[PDB]
């Protein structure tokens, strides 16, 4: 619900997510960029980092 709210239609996404009580398992490029964490790709994968 955090990657969809930054793309389009923030109000609708937020209001539906709040009703469905969705939990965000932060795993993605955009989400890790937003929360200031190493992206899971390239030199940020476990075998490399």
């Amino acid at each position: 619900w955090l990657s969809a709210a930054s793309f389009q239609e923030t109000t609708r996404v937020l209001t539906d997510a709040a009703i469905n009580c969705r939990s965000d398992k932060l795993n993605g490029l955009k989400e890790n960029v937003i929360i200031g964490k190493l992206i899971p790709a390239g030199t940020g994968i476990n075998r490399y980092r």
């Binding site: 709210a5 930054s6 923030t10 109000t11 009703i19 009580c21 955009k30 960029v33 937003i34």
Partner: protein, 147 residues
């Protein structure tokens, strides 16, 4: 029934009552995130959020006085409607009815406007930043350089 069941199952599966749609209290954002500045000389120009909070507070206090002192049902109902409208405009100004406009006939920036659009929080502050150790200048061709 498909859409009705969508919403009803959404509210049934989790321990989330549908009573959160009707509000009894209204949170207030911290002041340093809605600051008020002064133009040249020392004259303060109000922010949009402060004006909407002020309207809601005024309406709430006046309705409270009217109810406490006792009054005909019409006045109390009218004031409750005017409080409902103010609270609606606080969260989302312009969704229903005429936008609450400030000086110069321009709609105010509600709390919802902070999150939406190309100038909203996300696409202006979280997906892009202003970074130190950077500069800018015009480019010219150096033929003696190496790749």
């Amino acid at each position: 029934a498909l859409k009705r069941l969508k919403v009803v199952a959404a509210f049934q599966q989790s321990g989330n009552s549908p009573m959160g749609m009707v509000l009894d209290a209204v949170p207030v954002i911290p002041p340093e995130l809605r600051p008020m500045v002064q133009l040249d000389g020392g004259r303060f120009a109000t922010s949009d959020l402060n004006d909407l909070y002020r309207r809601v507070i005024n309406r709430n206090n006046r309705l409270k006085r009217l109810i406490d002192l006792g009054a005909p049902e019409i006045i109390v109902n009218n004031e409750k409607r005017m409080l409902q409208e103010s609270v609606d405009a606080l969260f989302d100004n312009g969704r229903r009815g005429r936008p609450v406009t400030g000086p110069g006939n321009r709609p105010l920036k509600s709390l919802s406007d902070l999150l939406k659009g190309k100038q909203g929080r996300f696409r202006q502050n979280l997906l892009g930043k202003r970074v130190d150790y950077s500069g800018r200048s015009v480019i010219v061709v150096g033929p003696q350089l190496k790749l």
